[PDB]
Each structure stands twice: as structure tokens, then as C-alpha cells.
Design a protein around this ligand. Structure first.
Ligand SMILES: Nc1ncnc2c1ncn2[C@@H]1O[C@H](COP(=O)(O)OP(=O)(O)OC[C@H]2O[C@H](O)[C@H](O)[C@@H]2O)[C@@H](O)[C@H]1O
Ligand SMILES: [Zn+2]
Length: 254
């Protein structure tokens, strides 16, 4: 029943006593760094109220609002993945699948985990314990998207590129795997819209130009090979001005 500002304050108090000036940032740091242990019901209710208020504060971007391109059913969205109302968003995860523990990190995993909320980290832990092993590169796992406007998250782990190294055919195809696996899973889940982030191009150091070429080529080859899934709209979600320019050059050349 507290206000959103007051909710942040109470959540911060619970997390601080259990064991950067904007309150949202302090809260985020604390929840980010928290090992994936069970969570008080009291905390979860505050966080749920907070994320519901967050949701009430914007109108999600719809698939219709995205930019069309030269290629049928491939669309472009330049913005934060947290505001996109699609069937599934693809998270560029790590192999433990537990999200990002680095406070207020600028990666998509952190943004997705923080605003989906804490039930996502707990769900991922249960999934990964059940599995009994870390995730391999280029696979796909489906979870709910919790408080996000998307319905589902598809978690995939892309390849790292050692700094200075170029993209070999193998490493190219490891990135391609993420796209193929995510598309295959979306179809099997009966979804009709999927948003990809620029997997591997942040923390994992995959060069943006090659990554965009791979992403586009892989989705187009998949569409040609999988006629059954022409019902699927794919959105490429760019977040950096460099990615915006690359995707524009490859999908919207006149
Ligand atoms: N809110 C956002 N919406 C859309 N795209 C975003 C957003 N935030 C970042 N991006 C873009 O998302 C893209 C991917 O950058 P990264 O998220 O580093 O993913 P990786 O696969 O390279 O690294 C994964 C590791 O880093 C994490 O800590 C994980 O836990 C793993 O340990 C870039 O284009 C970003 O600009
Ligand atoms: Zn991170």
C-alpha cells in the first residue's frame, strides 16, 4: 500500500538489513548483487507492487509500432527491451542462467532480471538445479517474463570473442546457433513475435558488424528453411547507435 518512492525505500531497508543516489539505482544494486537464495514473502510483495506501478507508468511499444524493413516479417526496434510488448524477448544470458550480479550493470540480462523481478532469478535457479549443469552456448530456454510487457523470455548464451581476435567460421556459427535455437523454440511455443537483442556484442565482445551480418543471415536462412513458420514476426532490437546504423544499412538499403 506504500507509494513507489516509499516502496523503494522499504525494499532497500529489507535488502540492506538482510545479509548511486537515485533510490531506484540503490535498490537495483542491492537486488542485482543478492545471491540466488530464497526471498521473504514480504520482500516479494513490495517488489511486486513496485513493478506493477512501473508497468502502469508507460504504454508498451507494440509490434505494430516497430519499423518495417525490406524483408517480410523482420522489423526493427531501437529502444529498451523492457518496454516491448512481444510474445518473447531473447535474453543474452550467461551459462548459469541466474542473471547479472554486477550492480547496475548496463547489460540486457541485468535490465531484464531487475524489471521482470526476483521471481525470474528464483525460477532460473530451480530450472538450472533440475538440469544439474550449466547451459551450453547457443541453446534456448523459455521462462515467463513476469512483470515485463513481453509474455516470455528466451534465454540463450552466446559465444565470447577474446579481445583482439576475429570471428572464425566456428565462432560465427556458435552465435548463429543462438538465433536458430531461439527461433525453433518460439515456433514450438506457438509464439507469433520474437525480439532479439544484439547477442554477444556487449560484455562478450563480439564485433557488432559481423554479429549483425550473422543475425540477419541466420534469421533469413531460417525463414527460407522453415516455411511452416511464416506466422512469425522477428524484431531486431538495437540499443546502441552503432547497432542502429548497421541494422539500417543491411535491412533498409534503398
Ligand atoms: N535494456 C536493453 N534493451 C536492449 N538491448 C540492451 C539493453 N541493455 C543492453 N542492451 C544490449 O544488449 C546487447 C548484448 O550485450 P550484453 O547484454 O552485454 O550481452 P552479451 O551477450 O555481450 O554478454 C552477456 C554477459 O553479460 C551479462 O552481464 C550477462 O549476464 C552475461 O554474463 C548489446 O547490444 C547491448 O547494447
Ligand atoms: Zn551484466
Amino acid at each position: 500500500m506504500p507509494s513507489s518512492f516509499d516502496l523503494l525505500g522499504e525494499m532497500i531497508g529489507l535488502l540492506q538489513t538482510e545479509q548511486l543516489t537515485k533510490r531506484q539505482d540503490l535498490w537495483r544494486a542491492l537486488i542485482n548483487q543478492r545471491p540466488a537464495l530464497p526471498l521473504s514473502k514480504d520482500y516479494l510483495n513490495l517488489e511486486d507492487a513496485y513493478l506493477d506501478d512501473w508497468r502502469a507508468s508507460f504504454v508498451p511499444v507494440s509490434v505494430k509500432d516497430c519499423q518495417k524493413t525490406n524483408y517480410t516479417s523482420l522489423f526493427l526496434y531501437h529502444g529498451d527491451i523492457r518496454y516491448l510488448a512481444v510474445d518473447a524477448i531473447v535474453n543474452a544470458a550467461n551459462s548459469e542462467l541466474l542473471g547479472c550480479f554486477s550492480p547496475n550493470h548496463g547489460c540486457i540480462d541485468n535490465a531484464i532480471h531487475t524489471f521482470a523481478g526476483s521471481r525470474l532469478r528464483l525460477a532460473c535457479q530451480a530450472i538450472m538445479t533440475e538440469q544439474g549443469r550449466k547451459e551450453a552456448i547457443g541453446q534456448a530456454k523459455l521462462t515467463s517474463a513476469y512483470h515485463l510487457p513481453a509474455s516470455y523470455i528466451i534465454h540463450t548464451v552466446g559465444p565470447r570473442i577474446t579481445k583482439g581476435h576475429h570471428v572464425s567460421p566456428i565462432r560465427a556459427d556458435l552465435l548463429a546457433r543462438c538465433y536458430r535455437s531461439s527461433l525453433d523454440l518460439a515456433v514450438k511455443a506457438g509464439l507469433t513475435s520474437l525480439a532479439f537483442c544484439s547477442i554477444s556484442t556487449g560484455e562478450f565482445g563480439f564485433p557488432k558488424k559481423e554479429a549483425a551480418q550473422i543475425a540477419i543471415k541466420t534469421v533469413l536462412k531460417w525463414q527460407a528453411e522453415h516455411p511452416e513458420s511464416k506466422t512469425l514476426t522477428t524484431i531486431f532490437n538495437t540499443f546502441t547507435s552503432e547497432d542502429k546504423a548497421l541494422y539500417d544499412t543491411y535491412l533498409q538499403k534503398e
